[PDB]
Design a protein around this ligand. Structure first.
Ligand SMILES: *C(=O)[C@H](CCSC)NC=O
Ligand SMILES: [Mg+2]
Ligand SMILES: [Mg+2]
Ligand SMILES: [Mg+2]
Ligand SMILES: [Mg+2]
Ligand SMILES: [Mg+2]
Ligand SMILES: [Mg+2]
Ligand SMILES: [Mg+2]
Ligand SMILES: [Mg+2]
Ligand SMILES: [Mg+2]
Ligand SMILES: [Mg+2]
Ligand SMILES: [Mg+2]
Ligand SMILES: [Mg+2]
Ligand SMILES: [Mg+2]
Ligand SMILES: [Mg+2]
Ligand SMILES: [Mg+2]
Ligand SMILES: [Mg+2]
Ligand SMILES: [Mg+2]
Ligand SMILES: [Mg+2]
Ligand SMILES: [Mg+2]
Ligand SMILES: [Mg+2]
Ligand SMILES: [Mg+2]
Ligand SMILES: [Mg+2]
Ligand SMILES: [Mg+2]
Ligand SMILES: [Mg+2]
Ligand SMILES: [Mg+2]
Ligand SMILES: [Mg+2]
Ligand SMILES: [Mg+2]
Ligand SMILES: [Mg+2]
Ligand SMILES: [Mg+2]
Ligand SMILES: [Mg+2]
Ligand SMILES: [Mg+2]
Ligand SMILES: [Mg+2]
Ligand SMILES: [Mg+2]
Ligand SMILES: [Mg+2]
Ligand SMILES: [Mg+2]
Ligand SMILES: [Mg+2]
Ligand SMILES: [Zn+2]
Lengths: 38, 118, 134, 175, 168, 224, 137
RNA sequence: UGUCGGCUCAUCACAUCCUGGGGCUGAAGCCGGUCCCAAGGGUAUGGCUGUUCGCCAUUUAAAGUGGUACGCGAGCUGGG
RNA sequence: GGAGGUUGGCUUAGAAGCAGCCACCCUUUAAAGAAAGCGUAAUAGCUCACUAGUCGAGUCGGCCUGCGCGGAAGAUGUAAC
């Protein structure tokens, strides 16, 4: 999990989801692409 | 991919030039045995070589617009196995019958020996 | 099974081993293939072999065309290919040499005419580090 | 609203009850599934089943397609069944179902005994395969997730309990 | 019986065990399969030109499965007594003592070499297994007699050291 | 003798080709010849491209006076595998500061030799910056020839740190700070935005506009 | 960095920054430009930082113009100094920016390459910017 | 409106030193690095120096960072 | 459906698309990569890419703008209507 003020897609398989009021990035391929906040 | 700029136009033009071949044409639907059996039917290219080809059903109606094999418009639904012969009318219907005898695929849609609605 | 026998394995079974990875069957019964087949091109050609377990142990040998790796190595120079292909030539090849084995390898190759058939081996010899010229 | 518009297409043997906002489905080989509807869906009944919205709100459009999918799961769940395949990977890992107790050996000092809830039943065809048979998806999926959470898969060798329709990442120690 | 260490720092020692054995017992654990050191051991045995008899050990463990070992050893050209038949396999349990008698039967069945020692009345001839220095009795040499008979009070020439045996 | 001479020839040729190597000399005693040869063979692949381990004296039996003062004459480490030292060797070891370790497993010896090898390399002398000053106006002092009246532009300046003077991006002097002053105070540190007086005895060549750079060197060392 | 070769006077009054940029608001040389949409001032270290971040991204052809020049000297009073005792010494040079001023120009590249490269430059500047195209009027 | 340091006695914050729960790792294991949650309880003895600090010696799971008139002289001391 | 030369060459006990390096062509096709992933001790075997069929009406993205969301950690007690 990476926590930053500026989260964004890092490849083609990343998804931008809003979960309970927080913007997150979840990747189905690379676990280092997980992000929180922003 | 398969764009409408030239993939639809080129295949239509080639098929139209191929519609002036021998009247007899064979149509089937191969959703069965692997491409090896399809390549086995392609071995006729060395011996018979009629058309050994399958094209999109949507473009099939657009092609054959010369009123030479118009009967195939109402029979080309779903998959198609257009196998129009070049000489010695027949052959394709007889060869595929032997091919279907030793397999389980191939449905055989119709024939085109002169004007004949299947 | 698609094991590649090497000019005979009736007595020896170092690389035959028809029991590991497949249902172990009679080795003495199966090893007599080197007698009936008797290779065909010197006692050096490694040929492909396909066998079926069938119901319980019924053996059946098919034998395919010789691999196009010994023909490109044991007929035109050193029997070992170059480590780096397309960067350091291993050995020159003429068009007739490829056509010499093209007719022998009449199995498959999906070639309608001999004009296309040669182009299949040309890409094979290039991957071996050899040099091919018309 | 593609999902909502699509009728359910229930099979031959299924009994339908509709007490307004209360629905219940009776089926052979497992039955007694019921649920309540939120106040913003109309379920017209015929030889088929179709779903419509009452308002034109955003949430009503979203929930109209959720109610359709929930009912479709109920209809399939009574006629057909729901099962979720699990498999164990490793040495010494084994499972065994003894009635309503499923005993697993997953590399701990003690063996774990998991109590299968009422409704679903598990059965072990072999020592490394688990089936979770049930008639509703939520209870079948939830139990399969609880069991999998005892020893979830590892990247370095792949050991642990995993879904049979799951892709497991692998890595190797450097050098 | 000769017992050799299994680590990789003693390979030379293992070589010295191969040139005196006349038979190699290769012990491989059923659970662990074939490992680098058993491959090195079969290389040593082949270099010595000596028959090999294995003992797939630790069979009492529930894992067991003494079958992948057969394929792994066949890959290194050690054929089981089954299949074709070159060397005999046998499952043993070491610390339960199951199959040990059958292993002994297999190893003593190797009388096909006939193990002729020539006369025991020849002058003694042997090889040094190890050597050490004792603060109370000088250099002590553990030697394996190969043929002949060694008697107390005899002139011995070993390596570059010579002398006669005060004690044995 | 022939093998020793040939090995010396080859080693001298290789060393003169490369440069020099730091040796760790050990005197090794063991209980059996097999253990001794195993230890000698296994303690040969432990070196590096800049450090190496040498066995200067082997043997079988207890540790004696001869090998004790053989280690004394080579700065060697005295290892005894499954053996003990006698009374005289103990006297010698107590008299000086020779380090003698006993062992019963070869891997303990390997671990200790690796740990000793890892303690003979101390590079990574790269610099990290602390502050920069810029000279404007020049003064003179009786003890320090040219005093640079300067202003610190970034970071910090400390009284005794290695310096680097550069004008037009080319270094001219690389000494250290000797005298740091605020008016007549002799301060030890000046932070950015403050004006100060810099004095170095050997700089002696000051001109307005020259940049003065202050850094430190931190040793993160290496590994094998 | 960028600063006048010589000046009539060493110092200046702070002044004020008001109005819009009616002059210097057109793409006069290139095809694409970076234009300021808020008012502030660039310190000649942000101009050089944004230039190197801009020319590096192109690295193959293209002509680049700079329409801003820092010609205003600013002073700064050193630490631990009281108020008064004269004006401070000049430390750096700055340029006044009003909304609508063109900052950089480029030609000889695609619209997408210029649009990517001006994004990198705008991240080094303390003011809002925008991307514009050349028009006849 | 008595200004450093020490003693005695404390109270709060969390930007967490230990213990507790997790994500990623260039995470094999044993150890680590980094980030997120968490303030319940804990969180050295000495040699030098007036010292706070610092450097050393030897421990500990750890020897946290700060606010409180740089907490506390109508509570003590008086080395600076 | 997802193929033939072909276990491409080297290395390796054995590297067969999938330990590691180099190369990455041709063939019948509608389509198939000297292969993106799982698995095998190495095979074998389930995927993906790509193409044909069904489906049956929308889909993709940018610009301007009103109100909102994160970025947002402190010391006696809520304590920034
Ligand atoms: C010395 O007086 C120094 C000079 C600053 S630059 C003329 N100022 C303060 O120490
Ligand atoms: Mg929650
Ligand atoms: Mg082990
Ligand atoms: Mg003013
Ligand atoms: Mg003006
Ligand atoms: Mg008072
Ligand atoms: Mg106290
Ligand atoms: Mg408080
Ligand atoms: Mg916190
Ligand atoms: Mg931090
Ligand atoms: Mg902490
Ligand atoms: Mg913690
Ligand atoms: Mg962690
Ligand atoms: Mg706490
Ligand atoms: Mg606390
Ligand atoms: Mg508290
Ligand atoms: Mg609290
Ligand atoms: Mg509590
Ligand atoms: Mg103390
Ligand atoms: Mg202390
Ligand atoms: Mg004192
Ligand atoms: Mg406090
Ligand atoms: Mg405060
Ligand atoms: Mg304070
Ligand atoms: Mg105070
Ligand atoms: Mg305090
Ligand atoms: Mg007092
Ligand atoms: Mg006081
Ligand atoms: Mg008093
Ligand atoms: Mg008072
Ligand atoms: Mg008092
Ligand atoms: Mg006093
Ligand atoms: Mg006094
Ligand atoms: Mg908006
Ligand atoms: Mg906000
Ligand atoms: Mg606050
Ligand atoms: Mg509070
Ligand atoms: Zn991603």
């Amino acid at each position: 999990m990476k926590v930053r003020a500026s989260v964004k897609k890092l490849c083609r398989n990343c998804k931008i989801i809003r979960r309970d009021g927080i913007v997150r990035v979840i990747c189905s391929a690379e676990p280092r692409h997980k992000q929180r906040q922003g | 991919m398969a764009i409408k700029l030239e993939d639809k136009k080129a295949i239509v033009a080639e098929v139209n030039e191929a519609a002036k071949a021998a009247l007899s044409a064979v149509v089937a639907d191969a959703r069965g045995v692997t491409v090896g059996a399809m390549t086995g039917l392609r071995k006729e290219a060395r011996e018979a070589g009629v058309y050994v080809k399958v094209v999109r059903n949507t473009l099939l109606k657009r092609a054959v617009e010369g009123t030479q094999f118009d009967v195939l418009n109402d029979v080309f639904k779903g998959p198609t196995l257009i196998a129009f012969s070049n000489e010695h009318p027949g052959a394709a219907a007889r060869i595929f019958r032997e091919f279907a005898k030793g397999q389980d695929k191939f449905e055989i849609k119709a024939a085109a020996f002169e004007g004949q609605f299947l | 099974i698609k094991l590649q026998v090497k000019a005979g394995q009736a007595n020896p079974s170092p690389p035959v081993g028809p029991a590991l990875g497949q249902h172990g069957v009679n080795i003495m019964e199966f090893c007599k293939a080197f007698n009936a087949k008797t290779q065909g091109q010197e006692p050096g050609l490694p040929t492909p072999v396909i066998i079926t377990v069938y119901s319980d142990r019924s053996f059946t040998f098919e034998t395919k065309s010789t691999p196009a790796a010994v023909l490109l190595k044991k007929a035109a120079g050193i029997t070992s290919g170059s480590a780096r292909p397309n960067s350091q030539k291993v050995g020159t090849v003429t068009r007739a040499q490829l056509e010499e084995i093209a007719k022998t390898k009449q199995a498959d190759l999906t070639a309608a005419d001999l004009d296309a058939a040669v182009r299949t081996i040309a890409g094979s010899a290039r991957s071996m580090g050899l040099n091919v010229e018309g | 609203s593609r999902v909502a518009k699509n009728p359910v297409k229930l099979p031959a043997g299924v009994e339908i009850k509709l007490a307004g906002q209360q629905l219940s489905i009776k089926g052979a080989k497992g039955a007694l599934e019921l649920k309540v509807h939120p106040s913003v869906e109309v379920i017209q009944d015929s030889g088929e089943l179709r779903f419509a919205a009452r308002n034109g709100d955003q949430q009503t459009r979203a929930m109209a397609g959720t109610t359709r999918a929930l009912v479709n799961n109920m209809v399939v769940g009574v006629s057909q069944g729901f099962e979720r395949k699990l498999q164990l990977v490793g040495v010494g890992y084994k499972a065994q179902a003894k009635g309503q107790v499923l005993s697993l050996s997953l590399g701990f000092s003690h063996p774990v005994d998991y109590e299968l809830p009422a409704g679903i039943v598990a059965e072990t065809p072999s020592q490394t395969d688990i089936l979770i048979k049930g008639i509703d998806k939520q209870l079948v999926g939830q139990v399969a997730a609880e069991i999998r959470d005892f020893r979830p898969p590892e990247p370095y060798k792949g050991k642990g309990v995993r879904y049979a329709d799951e892709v497991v990442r692998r890595k190797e120690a450097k050098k | 019986f000769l017992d050799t260490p299994g680590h990789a720092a003693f390979t030379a020692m293992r070589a010295r065990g191969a040139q005196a054995t006349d038979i190699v017992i290769l012990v491989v654990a059923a659970d662990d399969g074939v490992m680098p050191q058993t491959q090195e051991a079969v290389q040593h045995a082949k270099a010595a030109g000596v028959p090999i008899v294995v003992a797939v050990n630790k069979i009492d463990k529930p894992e067991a499965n003494p079958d992948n070992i057969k394929n792994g050893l066949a890959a290194l050209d050690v054929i089981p007594e089954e299949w074709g038949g070159d060397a005999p396999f046998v499952p043993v349990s070491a610390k339960l003592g199951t199959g040990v008698d059958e292993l002994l039967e297999a190893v003593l069945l190797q009388a096909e070499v006939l193990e002729l020692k020539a006369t025991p009345s020849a002058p003694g001839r042997g090889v040094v297994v190890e050597s050490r220095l004792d603060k109370g009795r000088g250099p002590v040499a553990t030697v394996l007699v190969q043929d002949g008979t060694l008697r107390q009070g005899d002139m011995v020439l070993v390596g570059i050291n010579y002398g006669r045996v005060r004690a044995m | 003798l022939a093998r020793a001479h040939a090995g010396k020839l080859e080693n001298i040729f290789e060393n003169m080709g490369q440069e020099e190597k730091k040796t760790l000399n050990i005197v090794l005693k063991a209980d059996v010849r097999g253990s001794l040869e195993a230890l000698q063979g296994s303690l040969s692949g432990l070196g590096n491209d800049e450090v190496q381990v040498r066995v200067v004296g082997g043997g079988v039996g207890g540790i004696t006076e001869s090998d004790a003062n053989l280690a004394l004459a080579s700065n060697a480490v005295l290892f005894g595998f499954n053996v003990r030292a006698d009374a005289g060797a103990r006297k010698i070891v107590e008299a000086e500061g020779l380090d003698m370790r006993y062992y019963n497993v070869i891997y303990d010896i390997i671990e200790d030799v690796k740990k000793a090898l890892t303690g003979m390399l101390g590079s990574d002398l790269r610099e990290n910056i602390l502050g920069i000053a810029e000279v404007r106006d020049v003064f003179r002092s009786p003890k320090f020839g040219a005093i640079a009246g300067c202003m610190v532009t970034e970071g910090m300046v400390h009284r005794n740190r290695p310096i680097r003077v550069l004008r037009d991006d080319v270094v001219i002097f690389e000494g250290e700070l000797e005298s740091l002053r605020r008016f007549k105070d002799d301060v030890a540190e000046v932070r950015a935005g403050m004006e100060c007086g810099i004095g170095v005895k050997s700089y002696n060549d000051v001109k307005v506009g020259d940049k003065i750079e202050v850094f430190e060197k931190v040793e993160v060392a290496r590994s094998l | 960095m960028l600063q006048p070769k010589r000046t009539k006077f060493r110092k200046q009054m702070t002044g004020h920054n008001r109005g819009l940029a009616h002059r210097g608001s057109k793409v006069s040389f290139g095809e694409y430009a970076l234009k300021a949409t808020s008012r502030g001032r660039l310190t000649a270290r942000q101009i050089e930082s944004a230039r190197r971040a801009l020319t590096r991204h192109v690295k193959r052809g293209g002509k680049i113009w700079i329409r801003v020049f820092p010609d205003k000297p600013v002073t700064k009073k050193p630490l631990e100094v009281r108020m008064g005792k004269g004006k401070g010494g000049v430390e750096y040079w700055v340029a006044q920016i009003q909304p609508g001023k063109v900052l950089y120009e480029i030609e000889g590249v695609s619209e997408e390459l210029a649009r990517e490269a001006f994004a990198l430059a705008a991240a080094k500047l303390p003011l809002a910017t925008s991307f514009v195209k050349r028009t006849v009027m």
